[PDB]
Structure formats: C-alpha cells, structure tokens
Symmetry: D2
Amino acid sequence: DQSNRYANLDLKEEDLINGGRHMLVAYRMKPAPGYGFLEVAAHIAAESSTGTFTRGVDALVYEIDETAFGDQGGLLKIAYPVELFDHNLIDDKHPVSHMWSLVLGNNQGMGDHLGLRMLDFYLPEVMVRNFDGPATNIEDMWRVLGRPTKDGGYIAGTIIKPKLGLRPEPFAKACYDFWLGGTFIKNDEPQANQTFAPMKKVIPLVAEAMDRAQQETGEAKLFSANITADFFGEMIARGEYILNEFAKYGNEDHVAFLVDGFVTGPAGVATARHYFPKTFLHFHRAGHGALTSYKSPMGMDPLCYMKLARLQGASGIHTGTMGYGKMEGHSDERVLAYMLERDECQGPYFYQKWYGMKATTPIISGGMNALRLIGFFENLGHANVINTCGGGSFGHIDGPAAGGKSLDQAYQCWKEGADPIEFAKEHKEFARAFESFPWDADKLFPGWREKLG
Amino acid sequence: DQSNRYANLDLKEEDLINGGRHMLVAYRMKPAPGYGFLEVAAHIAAESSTGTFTRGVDALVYEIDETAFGDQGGLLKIAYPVELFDHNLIDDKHPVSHMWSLVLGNNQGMGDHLGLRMLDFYLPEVMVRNFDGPATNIEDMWRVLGRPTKDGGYIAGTIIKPKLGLRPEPFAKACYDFWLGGTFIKNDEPQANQTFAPMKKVIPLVAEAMDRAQQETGEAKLFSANITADFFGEMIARGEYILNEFAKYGNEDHVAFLVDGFVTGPAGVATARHYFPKTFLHFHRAGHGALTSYKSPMGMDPLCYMKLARLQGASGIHTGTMGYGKMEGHSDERVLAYMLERDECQGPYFYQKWYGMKATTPIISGGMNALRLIGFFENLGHANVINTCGGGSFGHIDGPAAGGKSLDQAYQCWKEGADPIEFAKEHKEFARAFESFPWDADKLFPGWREKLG
Amino acid sequence: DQSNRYANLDLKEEDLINGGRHMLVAYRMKPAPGYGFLEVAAHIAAESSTGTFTRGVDALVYEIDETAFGDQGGLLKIAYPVELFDHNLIDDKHPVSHMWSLVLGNNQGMGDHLGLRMLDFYLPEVMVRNFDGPATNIEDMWRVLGRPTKDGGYIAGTIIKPKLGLRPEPFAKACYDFWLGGTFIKNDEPQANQTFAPMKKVIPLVAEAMDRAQQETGEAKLFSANITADFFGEMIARGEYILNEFAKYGNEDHVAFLVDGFVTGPAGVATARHYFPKTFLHFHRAGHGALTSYKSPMGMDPLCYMKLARLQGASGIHTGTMGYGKMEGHSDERVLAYMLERDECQGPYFYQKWYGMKATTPIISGGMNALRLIGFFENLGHANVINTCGGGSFGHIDGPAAGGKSLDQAYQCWKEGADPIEFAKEHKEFARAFESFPWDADKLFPGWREKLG
Amino acid sequence: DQSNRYANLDLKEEDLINGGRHMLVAYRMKPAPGYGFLEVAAHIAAESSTGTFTRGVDALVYEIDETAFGDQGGLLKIAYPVELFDHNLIDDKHPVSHMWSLVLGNNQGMGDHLGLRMLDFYLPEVMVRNFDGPATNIEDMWRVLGRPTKDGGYIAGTIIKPKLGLRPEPFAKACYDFWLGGTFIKNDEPQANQTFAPMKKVIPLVAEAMDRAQQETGEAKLFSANITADFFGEMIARGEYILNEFAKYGNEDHVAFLVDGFVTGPAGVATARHYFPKTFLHFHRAGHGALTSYKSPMGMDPLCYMKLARLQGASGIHTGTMGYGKMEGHSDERVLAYMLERDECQGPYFYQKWYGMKATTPIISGGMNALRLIGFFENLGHANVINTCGGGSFGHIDGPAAGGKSLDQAYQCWKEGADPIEFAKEHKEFARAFESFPWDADKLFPGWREKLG
C-alpha cells in the first residue's frame, strides 16, 4: 500500500552508488501469506526510516526479485539517505548501534514477512570516513616483534586446554611451555576473574611466564587478555590492571585485549577502542551465531558482521579456516578476510572502498597445523594472519613449543616457495609435524615416509 | 562421545534447584544428520563450559527429551556451576555479557546441530543478588507525577508521527499539543542528532514545550530522550546535555533516557545504568527480532530476553499488547509482564525469584486505544504500565490532547469497576473515543450508539 | 604603562554590578620597589585577561586604594567581562579551573608585586546560573534520618582516634560503639586503602557495624567514606565498591563520599559531583592552608575558597568553630557559613546572590562539646550543621555513645530555648557532660554543681 | 609535648635513606610565640600521620636546626613510613593527591607555627616505581619531527599575541604565518571555548593552517591545544574532538594537549594522562604561584612542584629562562630542568633516583631570542627543550617565520660549536636577529656590526 511513497523501482543502482548520498542494503525477504512482495518491501523501507520535509529522507525500495531464492524468498534492495544517520556530539561520527537500528532494527519484528536477512550493504565515502575504524592491527604486532611492517607475515598462536578451569599456576606454566617456541597466546572467551582463577592471581603469573620465556629465547611473545565486562569502568579497571602488570617487565605493548564483542555489543567494543586505542583489540565473536547463522532467516550474513566489526574498530577477528581446517569450510570464504584487510573489496552485492580505514586482521583458528598451512596460505594469497592452533601446536609429538616452531616453519616454507618435503629435511620441527599428523601427510605429501625416514 | 563426562541424566532438577549452586538453562535443539541427541547435548555442555580441578565446574546435561518438539527438535537442559561465572573487579557482580557468552555463546555456531534456542533459565539466589538490576522504574515516575508509589497506575503516552524526519520546531509543537492532555512522550528509536534536527536545536524546544504545557495545565509531563551511542563518553555527553536543558525549567527529574539496548548491547545499557542510575532507563528493543523471533531456531525466546533486560537494569521495556492491540498478540503473553515486574514469577520451565530486585516496568504499545484498555487491564490484573498510543491518541477525533485524556479516563473507568458506557456519559473524552473508533465500540460495547446519542 | 588601556578608574562599581556583565574581584596587592600601584594593577589586569576585537574583553582596573593596608599593600579591584570565561562543550557551563586560571593564575607569579591576594569576588546572575553547584546537602541527610527537610537540625558526629593506623576490626568496633548513641562518622582524610587496613577489608566491617547499630537502636546512622584518588576511574571504582557494600544492608543512601578537594583539585571534586551527584560530597580541605592561610600574601581568603567550593558542588565543607571551640576562632567567621548555606549573602566587598543554587552545609569541628554547642548555636542563628566532635564525644565520662547523645541533647535544649541546667535535670547524658568537662561548666553555667548534685 | 613519641633525633638520615622504607621531607618552619621548635615539629609529624599497631606508622621528626633560617625559622625533617601511603584499587599505585594530603595537608593550617614550607622530599625506590610518571615527552615529538630520538634537540616555538581575544580566522592565520618557519605553537592557558572564538570554529582552522604550512614547507609542525576542564567527560570530549579534526589531515600525532594542572589539580592531569597517555601532556602551571612563590612561608618550593608534576605524568612543563631571558632568573635554576629530565638528580636536601621513570621535558619561555639561546644552551649543557618565544619570534624584523628560523639556527650554531658571528655570515635569519635585537648583540657579540655590515 505504501509502495507509491517508499518504492521507486525506476532508480538505477549505479546512479545511487555514483552519487554517494545513500547507504544501500540488500536483503533476503520472504513475504507472509496474503502479502505482496513489493507491499512488504515498501513497508520495510517505511519501518526502517520515516515510518509513514519527511519525503527527502524516506528510505526507498529500488530493486526487487521476488523469486531470487525460491522457497527461501526473494531479493530486496533499499536505499537509505545518508541524512538519516546519527552524529556524535563529540566528533560527528556515526554510531554503529544507530545505523543497525535503522537498517536491521524494528524490521526484524514485522509480521508481514517470514524472514528478513541482510546479505550485504554499501557505504559511500561520506559515511565510511565518519566511522571510528581500527586504530591498531597486525602491523603493530609486527613492530613489537621486530618484523617489517609491510608483509611481516604469520604469527604462530595457540589456545590453552582445558579452555576454562585451569588454576592460575598451571595456566601460566602452559603459557611458558608454549612460548618457548610459539609467539601468541589468548585467554578463552569466558576466562577472566572466576573465583577458582582470580585475575589478580593469574595475570602476574602470565606476565612472569612471558618475561622468563623472552629471556630464555631472546624472542618477543604476545598475550591477548580478556577484559570483557558490561560496565565501562570495569573494563577500564581490567585493562589498566593488566597493562601495569606487564609493564613491570617492560612488556606493556606485548598485550592485546580480548573483547567478546557480540555479547557486549558495539558499545563494549567502543569502550576498548576509545580508551585503549593503541592496545590491539581482539574481537571474539562468541554468540554471534544467533545473528549470523545460515540456519536463521533473520539477522545478517557473516560478511556483513565482518564489515561492522571493522567499522567499530576491531584490530583482529576470527574468520575461519576456509575449508583447510576442521569447521564450516570453503576456500571461497576468503572474501571474509579480504573485506576485513584490504583497502577495497568486492562483496556479494556491493563493491566497498575503505578510503584508508585500517585493516582488521584475520585471526585463523579451527584445526590447522603446519602441513595444512601451506595450502591455506596459497589459497589466501598471503600469510599476514594470526593463527591459534589447539591441536596443531600441543598435538605435536615433541610438545607445544615444537608445535609452535613447526607453524612458523610452515610460513617460511611457503614464503620461500620451497617443496615442503625438501624443506622438512632441513627443519626438524616441520619434519616432525609429518609424524604428528601422518593422516594429513599421507594425503598432502605422498612419499614423505621414504624421503624423510 | 563426551556424554560420559558432560552428561548425568540421573541428576534430579529439583535437587539442582534446591541446592542453589547451579544456573539451569532449557534449550530446543535439533541434531544434525548422523549425530545422536545426547552426543550433541554433551558437546554443547562442553563447548559452553570447560571445553574438553576442571571436573568440578563442567556444565552437565541433566535432562533430554529428543522428541519433545517433533521436526523442530527436542528438549535439552544443562546445569552450569555458579563458579563458572565472572566477577567484576570493582563490585564482584556478574557481567551479563559474560553469562551470555557461556550459555549462548560458541554453542550458537556448532555444526552438529541444526538449531539451538534458549527457552528459559534459572538463576539461584547467589546469582540473582549479584546482578545490577534496575535502579529506577515506574514508581519513580509516580513520585514525580504526585501519585501514590504503591499502585500509582497508568501513564498515558504517545509517539510522534512521522517518527523520523520532523524538524525541531514542528516536533516540539506536536509534543506541546499532546502534553495539554497526555503525560508521556518518547523519541523514536533512531531519532537523535541528525543534521535536519540537531539535538542541541530540538531538545531546548522540547524542554520549553514541557514547561509551557505544565504551566497551562498544572500537571506534570514526562519526556523520554534518546541517548543511544556506541561510546560511553558520547552517551554521557548526551545525557548531561539533556538533563541540563530540562533543569533550566526545574524539570530534570521529568526526563527518562531511551537506550536502544539491543544494538548497543548490554555494555551500552550498563553505561546508562551506572552513570545515570536515577534517570529512568527506557530500554528500546529495536533489532532484537534477529535474536528472539520465533522464525529463528537460534537465539532465545522473548521471555529470556526480558529476564536479561531486568538484570542489566532496564527501568522499562516494551512487552506488547497481548492480543488486545494490533500486533502479534495472545492474552497469555502476560507472563512477559509478570516476569519483568513481580518479585517472583513462574516461567515456561523454571520458577524465578528476584529477591527484591526492582521491577522493570512494562511499556505497552501497538494499536491500543481507550476502549481497548479496559479488556487489556482486566486481563493483566493491574494498570501499572506506561502506554504509548499512536492512533489511540492522535486518532481521537478531537485531537491528541483529547486522545491522551481518553486514555487516562479508561484507567479511571477500570479502576472504578464502572460500566464503560455509563462512565462515558460523565466523561466526554472517553465518550468521544467511541466515535473515534466506532468499529471497536460496536464490537466491545454494542448499544453505545443509542445510550450516548 | 598599560594603565591607559587596562584601567578606567571612572567606572562606578554599582554600574558594573547592576549591569550584570562582569565578574569583579577585590585583591590586596603590594607593589615591588620602583613600581607604581596603578602601573602594577594595570599589568595584573592585562596578565589576567588579554595580555597586551580584543579591547571589548580586556579586564579593567576600576578602583584602587594604594594605602588601604599600610605596609601590607593596598586595595585593587578588577572587572572581568563575562565573555572571557570558558564554556563546556557538553553543557555550556563555566569550569571553575578556568575561572581560577584568569583571576588568580599567572598573576600569582609576577615580579612587579610582593603580594597579590584575592579578598572577595562578585559573580553576576549569568555566571552563577552557569556553574554546577551542589546536588546534595544536609537536606538529603535529613530525609534519610526521618527528619523534616526544612529545619531538620543538628547531626551529631565524631572522628575516630587514632585517625590513621587502626586495623579494620578495631576501626569498625569504634564505629559501632559510637553509633549506639551518635549519628555521623567520617574517615580521616588520608585513611583509605593502606596495606594495614585495606578498603575491601574495613568497608564490609563498617557496613556491618552500621547495620548492627541500626537494628539495636532503631535509628538511622551515616558514614562518610574517603574516595579520594587522582584518577577518575579509581574514584569511580572506590565509590561503586563502597555503595555496593552498604547496599547489601539496604543502607546505600546512608553513605556520603569524602573527597580531599584541595589536593585533588576541582577536577577531582567534579568527578564525584558528576558521577555520584546524589551521594553527599563531603569536601575535606586538607592542604588548603597553603592557599588560604593569612600568613601568605598570595592566594585567596577563606571566604573565597568557600564560594569556589559551593560552585564546584560540595555538599558540605569544614568551616570552623567560630571561637566557641579550640582553633582559630571569632564569632564573626559566621559569614563563612552564611555564604555557603544562604540564598544570598553579603561578603567583605561584594553582595552575592546564589539564584537558587543549593546550599553547601557547614561541617563544624574543633574541640566542641555539648555545653559549648548552646552558645555556638545562638551565635550562628540555627543548628542546621553536621558536627564532628573528637573529645566532645569519646571524652564523655560515660563513653562515646553517651557523648553522641549529649550532643543531640544540646540541640534539643537550644531548640526548646530551655535553661541548660534545668534541661540537664531531665536529660542524663547532657547532665553528665557537665562532669565530663567541668572546666567549661564552671565557666558557662556557674552553680551547676549544686543544682545537679 | 608529643616529642617523646613523634621525634627520634638519634635516627641517622643515611640509615633512613639506605633502608628504603621511608619518604623523607625537609621543611622550613617558624614556631609561633611561646612554642618550642621540637614541640611544634613533633606536632607536625603527628598531624601529618597518625594524629596522636599505630606506633609502627608514626611519622618521625629525625632532624631539626632551629636557627637555620634566622628570622624565617629553622629546618625540620620528618620521616614518613611508606605504609602510610595509599594504593589504588585498580593498579596499586600511589595517588599524588593522597601523598600531598599527608606531607603538606592539615599541617598547613596549624596555629602553633607562623610558616611551614616544603623544601625537598625523598622518595625511595618502592614509592617511585609506584607512581604513574610520564608516558610521553620530547622524544615522541622528535619521532614525529623525523629527528633522532636520542638527542633530537631544540624545538622552536611561539605564543600568539594577543594571547586571548583573537577571533578564529585571525588566530589560524597567525599560526600559519609562524609555521612557515617555526615548529611549535600553543594555546594560551585560558584560551579554549569562549563565545568569541568557539573551539569548534577555531580548531578546524588551525588544523587547516597546519596542513597548508606542512604542504608548503615539507616540514612537520606541532600544536598544543588546551583541553582544560573540571569534568573528566568534558576533557575527554575536547581531546577526542581535537584529535579527530587533526586526523582529517593525517596530523593526529602532531597534537599535544595543554592542561592547566594547578587549577585542575592532580586529578585533571591524571584524566589526560590515563585517557590520552600517548598525547603529549603539556602541563601549564598557571596559578601555581599561590603555592610556590617565595613570598609565601607556606606551600612548597618550585623544585618540589616539579617533582610532583613528573610523578603525575607531565610530558613537559615550564621551567624558566634561568637568568638568560626576562623573568626571575639565575643560571642555578638549571636544577629544576635536571630534576625533570634526568634519571637521577641531586636536590637541595635529597638525592633522587627515578628508576627509569620517563623525563618531563623543560618548556622554556621568558623573553628568549636566537642570540641569547647560545649562552642558555651552554649553561644547561644541552638543547633538548621546547621553547616558546613571543618577541624572539614575532619581534624578528623579517617576521615570525624568520624569527622561528633564527631560533633553529641558534641551535645549529651551538650544536656545531661555531662562532656565532662567523655562523651568521652563512645563515641570514640568525644574522638578522642581530639587527632585530641589537641591544643584545652589542652586549653578547661586540664587533658584529662591522663583521656583518
């Protein structure tokens, strides 16, 4: 019924993009029984904007394909005038929370559709330049590690098992054991200040373990510490406490902050981004599946969530192993990494320029090991990632330290374009990964058994 | 496979509840093809706790009914030791974000189920007493309005149309026009500091409109102002600016703060709750449908979201018209209101005591009017609600002020247990609501035409 | 030399005051050898404003009396255009820090005077209405105590001895012992989180002592807890921690916050005033003597410091016993109390209206006891003060609880206009104060020995 | 009377220092008539500590010289057990405010002395390591300027005249004019957000002037922007706003923050130090004369104030021209610079180690010019200072840009150990400073007229 006002299917998407005055959003939408696709689409545009000088700022349906997705619905595109979006009193920037409240707010509760899912969105220059974006990313880690800041490459990481329940001294010992070979360690997403492992007991022991490993290896080590909380004053207290403990050893810039960004919401990410901009903001997505799982016809696709994380200021975020590990996996998920790290990236429906906004670094995890990293790097096109390997490190038959080394050595091998089996003859930890995971070696490198003994 | 460790189906739920040492959660879960219900359930418990002294804090599957929901899956219940939950350094309280990250975190991304949905949860005394809870609710509005703080009753509200796009002077004029009869006005959820209606232009005009209406009517008026932002410093700036503008007229405690709590996340709600505890925190759910819509097999049921909002400190939150307005509606949704406002409430799977935690006030909206309010009150059992009526107020044939009066008069009629038609003979605005909405009057009060002329 | 620009002795002070566009300041100034009084005065005006459209905002010397103070110098008055003063981005209010930086900033370091002291200042309406002012004062304590909020009267307090060094349990015990008779207890100004009495050990014991005393007496008790710190995040952590501990007993609004406002500076007072406005801000002046002692020819007179404390938002501040206790004392210091608590007050050089800005409550201390309070009240004209008595309470021969009662009973006696000796016959604790301090009784009430036995 | 408890003149200062368990303070004190020097000294120790397990933490008088200062009093030294000092809940560090409240708090108001002045103090290692200290100093400016971070040398600055009153466009133009030759510009201490030059009008113009000057010169420029306020939320708003405006040109790390630290107090400095640690904190002392002027027998000597500023985290602070400019001046004030910038420094009574705490950079100002800088550098021993020259820059007969160059060229000449007159033959701006200030050239370089024409 509102299609006359809130729909203009004669608008051309290219004119909307070249004009630079609209945010565009593509959705998958399924009309409820009795309702027409255009009528529901126009209703969505109204609910997502002026709900009805007002004409100039109406959101407009400009494209529909009612049959695009068969029994899962059709394609819907809406243009949002940039004047709809809010501005901080302090710095005039757009809140992410506010943008979300328009393009995916009340329209998620409507009764005249059976599903409404964001697939992609386009931000014009005037909007992109008005979000925080990241302040820190892997480039700052490369600097702390003594690497080039251009293509400093791969950072070998792990997660400690059991992920929750270890008392303070056993946790610090596991950190030390790995840091004798590996580089990066993170808290588990709900590991913080439980009574059985209080923050102010475990953090001093971890700082001491870092110092010991660094003195014994001569190599710099990194720790990502959970500061998740609801209250900004608490997250400030956690971060300041942690940085001061690491500062007692000269290692304050070896600390990253883990923030469970989905369960805090954008406001919690913004607390860390604004108060601690120069501390790497490690965005943990725990819980995001409720919003982004393909099993839901609501919410948004993972690529959209990635774009929003970069705008909020994530220094790094989990992306996935892209079919080379042990999760949901296709080599074609590389677009999630590209959209996070490149200055420009083609998305499923919109080409996105980032106009110099800093990259968000992909954090790879999901049953990866040294043998698998070669194919993973080759598919991605680079190795500028952080990688947490649970079994790929502690599952090394020579121990977690050897596991960590075997991961670094996988990066060297790829970087050199060397033959993995020939490379292994001169690099023991990589060679011993073949024996640690021979099911994978038999597959990827048939013949290794004879060539390596 | 992990069922031996992470499942104990011999545990009795009543023993877990009477013991007071576990949070319990009920889920609807559908196993993926090839996986057994118990195996997946145990995997969920592991992923949601210790991921594997550790045995004492494992989450445990204690009840399953694999066929409870037919093709939508089965019922799964998990017990979480209270020792799993985090504690603020500052005040030892539990973060809501953290609790969410365990009971509905990584388990939302697992590949061995086709759906995992929270239906209800149980907090024992030791946990309930360790959340913020609300600091302010309708009782504080009753005080400002000169009402009894016991059963002060109904607050007549409206929303301004168009909800977004009005320039500052037309918006303030609409506020004045309604406040000559009604009491409560709110911003629209994305209405804030747009260039076409800057905060520092519209807020002074609204404060002036309140003052004028209060001087002309002798009655106190209320305004709920949007302070949504990502950054705590910005939300502080907005709130302090707004309170100071209303303070210039002596009306600072006539201000409530609207916070789009789903798109800010719990951290944004906590900013308002901690910095502005004595300013009514009006929680707007815009976007929550992605998490709570019944169209998704992920996320959580609305009742769970309501419980979480109270723990975070919402002073009020939208619940719905419960089948008496024009939305998704059943009289049985009254449990959402009861769980928000009562000191104790039976939920779908767990009885919940709140141990003196303040109520969160239901904010009713969705095509309500004066005629309909009688049946709505009778079903709910009380009228201690805030109610925003768009058409029920501005749709009054005598204008928004008359509409607002007709809503108050509906409360009086119910409160008096009077016959609505007899009551209308002595209350003109209520009587004129019959003519404003005669389709409803013909239905609810057949005969009114003759008795009222 | 700059007298032609920065001096206009033809300006009339009454015209400057009635115009409402200037802050005026009176100083005592002593020229250095070789310099003329007017030349130095004009230099001060230049240094305190434009240092030289600029003419419209120059500060102007409008009155001088070179011989007013003999060998201590002369009188100097300067008019500051209100346009010179700063405005917060957030709420447009004047920072106290900024105002201080102009009227008493670089002019304190000049080499062409041997002394420059602020004696008084005048704020016009447009400025007074643009400072924070207090949010809380004794009226809020009266409410918590179940008193009338009009002239609720005297609050009997004490300080614990030794003021610093008591371990947590002995300190809480002393609090309990006094609270069985008295009402108000404060931390000592440097008593906070020392290793020998950690905050998180002593505060729970004090909260428990309050609860016990309140259950046993049926009377409400008050505690003023030190939250002094440099860092706003720490002061927030302290205040939230303390309020939560008292909230466990339902006594959160029985807490006041002590802030060492001179050593934090105005910024620290503002942290408490903005974050915790509804918690009584007990301003402790420790260290102010460097700025306000009459032994210095620099700085400002105590009356000026009092005015600044009210503008910053002190709920109460120490004033002194005004010659009725054991300190620097003259009955004429009552102007310090009047300037803090009245809506209008004559100062030494300027009449000051406060335009409804809340009172700052006088906190009396300095060797007062029940016998002395009568004359003190009569001189002041009221008893709306908080009073901490060290010896007047614990020095009671029947103990601190009896001492506290004897102080309340002194207020009752004055309030009743009763004869103190006749009153004592029917009030045992007051009567026993005569025996506790007979040197004072012999003086003030000759004959008591016979009439009371 | 309390000398038996609070005095132990048999203690040896060297034992107290080598033990590392006491802060020591030296004072000048004058007893009031009738009081003995030791009795008053012991009273001061009591008032400054336990006011009376308590014995172990008493402050102790360990040295007195009653005649040390003739009619100005005698010397008094007091030892403070480190256990007396407070600890943040967050990071366990000592608040400066709290330390001040003990060693120079209530003892400033006592009636049994006619003066009590801090001359020096000693912090042992355990205390020094427990203060914030600076996070940023001139080394970070050297990095932004492309200089070595070791001895990067002199930064040529100016102040704009008139210091207060310029509208936004004329102020930005003056900044541009100077930046074509000079490097560093600062706001005046009370210049901020006045109605005649609003922050959000002038700051964008200054950022644009920086960009233009940098594009035209190819050299990096620096601006120190006033963020002084009482309220931490306002100072955050100012700083974030300013950094974002400079970030629009890629110049966010070209910004320093000016904080009027005396009138905000330590709490305001801490806000900037904690929220903006990596932005150079330019501490402006406006008003400190009330506390540190030698005309007062109260307060503290400038050297003490300098030590406190470093502990609070000042990146730089004004010291003075040390007799080479036009102020209070003696070459021997170089100790103020040495105590701020060295890792170890002898003070008037105590040798102070800083244990790696970052330097606070001296900011030199007070009628300096290029000719005078040579002798100033030679006396100081280095040129690692920031220098604001009002007349030494704009007073150059060829303009402010030429003036700024002449200052840089003075540094080069000193650095080269070259003869100033010979150097001038090959450096025009330096040569033209001789003509700009020939009174100084005739004095310092007799003969220049003939050698340079």
